[PDB]
Amino acid sequence: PLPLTALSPRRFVVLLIFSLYSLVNAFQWIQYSIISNVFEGFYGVTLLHIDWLSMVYMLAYVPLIFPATWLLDTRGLRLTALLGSGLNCLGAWIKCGSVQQHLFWVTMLGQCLCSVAQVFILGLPSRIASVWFGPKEVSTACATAVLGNQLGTAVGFLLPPVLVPNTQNDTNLLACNISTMFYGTSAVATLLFILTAIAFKEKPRYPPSQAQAALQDSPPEEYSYKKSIRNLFKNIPFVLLLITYGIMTGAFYSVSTLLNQMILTYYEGEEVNAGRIGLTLVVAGMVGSILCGLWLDYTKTYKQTTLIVYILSFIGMVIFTFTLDLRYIIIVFVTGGVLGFFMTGYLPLGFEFAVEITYPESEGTSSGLLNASAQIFGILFTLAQGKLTSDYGPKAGNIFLCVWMFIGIILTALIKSDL
Numbered sequence: 445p446l447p448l449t450a451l452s453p454r455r456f457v458v459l460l461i462f463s464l465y466s467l468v469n470a471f472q473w474i475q476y477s478i479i480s481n482v483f484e485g486f487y488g489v490t491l492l493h494i495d496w497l498s499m500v501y502m503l504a505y506v507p508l509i510f511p512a513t514w515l516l517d518t519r520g521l522r523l524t525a526l527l528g529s530g531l532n533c534l535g536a537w538i539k540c541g542s543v544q545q546h547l548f549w550v551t552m553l554g555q556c557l558c559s560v561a562q563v564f565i566l567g568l569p570s571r572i573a574s575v576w577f578g579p580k581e582v583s584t585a586c587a588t589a590v591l592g593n594q595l596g597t598a599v600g601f602l603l604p605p606v607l608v609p610n611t612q613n614d615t616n617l618l619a620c621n622i623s624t625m626f627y628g629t630s631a632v633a634t635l636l637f638i639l640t641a642i643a644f645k646e647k648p649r650y651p652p653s654q655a656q657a658a659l660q661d662s663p664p665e666e667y668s669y670k671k672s673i674r675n676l677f678k679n680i681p682f683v684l685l686l687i688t689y690g691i692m693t694g695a696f697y698s699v700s701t702l703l704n705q706m707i708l709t710y711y712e713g714e715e716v717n718a719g720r721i722g723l724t725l726v727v728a729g730m731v732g733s734i735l736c737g738l739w740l741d742y743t744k745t746y747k748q749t750t751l752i753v754y755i756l757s758f759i760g761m762v763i764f765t766f767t768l769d770l771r772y773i774i775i776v777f778v779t780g781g782v783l784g785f786f787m788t789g790y791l792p793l794g795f796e797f798a799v800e801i802t803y804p805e806s807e808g809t810s811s812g813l814l815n816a817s818a819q820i821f822g823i824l825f826t827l828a829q830g831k832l833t834s835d836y837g838p839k840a841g842n843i844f845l846c847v848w849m850f851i852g853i854i855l856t857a858l859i860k861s862d863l
């Protein structure tokens with residue numbers, strides 16, 4: 445073992461920049477939904493338009509995930525990072541010019557650009573950790589990278605409600621507030637893109653790890669994504685895990701998208717409290733993910749922990765469903781915290797379970813399949829729950845999510861694995 449491995453400080457920068465601009469991307473995913481009523485009033489559109497603003501992120505991932513993976517594998521890390529940062533910045537700039545009562549389509553175009561950016565952004569963490577960090581720091585680097593996107597989602601929940609008060613009567617003030625938010629986002633994105641261009645190197649001068657040294661020394665042989673996908677689908681346990689992970693992530697996405705509508709249904713003039721509830725959910729989910737990772741480190745068992753977390757998530761969802769309409773915000777906070785805790789704690793455990801089931805196949809293809817299933821389930825759940833809430837109230841959509849979570853529990857139980 446003589447790879448001449450060395451560790452460079454640049455790796456930290458490579459992480460930071462990424463964890464920054466990825467964060468910004470997340471902030472742009474949920475900025476509209478959290479104050480969806482305000483934008484609906486401003487643009488004179490329906491809630492479905494604001495829901496589609498969030499759902500374009502999910503729609504763009506499925507068709508572009510695998511071509512993006514091929515581009516990353518061939519061209520390298522720097523091109524992917526530049527594409528993601530530049531697309532995010534361009535989307536923010538386009539949104540900056542969409543502040544008018546009749547310019548919704550401009551904001552939709554900007555959101556589509558950010559959606560295309562997300563495709564490059566999402567899969568970067570593991571590659572960055574492997575390329576730039578040593579064996580003892582890969583897991584921590586990847587965890588920090590994903591927590592960056594989670595924190596971006598939390599900030600997207602918290603900030604827009606405060607930045608833009610619901611001053612429907614005064615259109616000029618509302619336009620000024622929207623312009624301020626968009627310009628701030630655009631400035632941050634531009635700065636992050638400039639930093640990525642200046643400092644985001646392709647790879648360190650020397651390999652960080654012996655495994656990375658071997659990977660760089662010998663180019664990978666030609667591989668087919670379609671063959672790997674076909675082989676993965678033949679594995680029934682992996683298909684079941686895909687379905688359950690997609691169901692859980694789609695439920696989380698639907699809850700995030702429609703949280704403002706559900707809270708506004710029973711609480712009037714509480715957009716700031718809705719943003720606080722969303723941030724509490726996201727932070728509790730981050731804590732649950734960290735605790736679940738440590739728990740899995742302590743005990744290697746995957747099936748039992750995954751099933752327990754799924755059942756706890758279902759219980760929390762039921763409690764939130766039957767406590768939303770109690771007309772007390774504190775119970776909403778507590779229920780959202782518990783639900784987010786369990787929901788987000790499930791995801792890393794499911795991902796590790798997936799990689800364990802599909803060890804022979806590449807991690808990238810399984811990651812892409814899991815993310816695509818998550819996006820598809822998110823779109824379906826968002827549409828169904830939004831229609832139910834508009835027609836029969838939030839309780840109908842929440843019960844729909846509860847039933848889907850129960851189905852996910854049953855599917856998780858059926859999984860067969862010796863891990």
Ligand SMILES: CC(C)CCC[C@@H](C)[C@H]1CC[C@H]2[C@@H]3CC=C4C[C@@H](OC(=O)CCC(=O)O)CC[C@]4(C)[C@H]3CC[C@]12C
Pocket residue numbers: 490492493496497500503504556559560
């Ligand atoms: C480049 C990638 C990211 C794909 C981008 C696709 C979008 C440009 C499309 C996909 C789905 C479309 C949406 C599908 C359904 C609707 C509902 C539709 O509502 C109505 O026509 C009825 C409104 C009323 O009730 O008065 C308005 C357009 C909208 C938001 C569409 C807007 C354009 C969207 C977002």
Ligand SMILES: CC(C)CCC[C@@H](C)[C@H]1CC[C@H]2[C@@H]3CC=C4C[C@@H](OC(=O)CCC(=O)O)CC[C@]4(C)[C@H]3CC[C@]12C
Pocket residue numbers: 506507510668669670671673686687690813816817820821
């Ligand atoms: C479990 C449910 C909820 C989700 C199921 C989703 C999959 C069935 C979809 C999601 C994205 C799809 C992929 C999107 C794009 C492509 C690229 C496409 O490329 C080619 O035609 C050439 C492939 C090659 O280079 O070998 C082949 C199909 C494939 C892999 C698709 C196969 C089917 C996939 C994996």
Ligand SMILES: CC(C)CCC[C@@H](C)[C@H]1CC[C@H]2[C@@H]3CC=C4C[C@@H](OC(=O)CCC(=O)O)CC[C@]4(C)[C@H]3CC[C@]12C
Pocket residue numbers: 832836839840841843844847848851
């Ligand atoms: C795996 C997938 C395909 C399962 C799909 C199940 C749906 C068909 C279920 C799940 C939740 C159900 C909803 C749960 C609650 C309600 C509220 C209910 O309200 C009423 O008007 C009657 C009760 C009351 O008076 O409050 C009307 C039916 C509805 C929308 C239900 C309609 C049927 C839904 C969408």
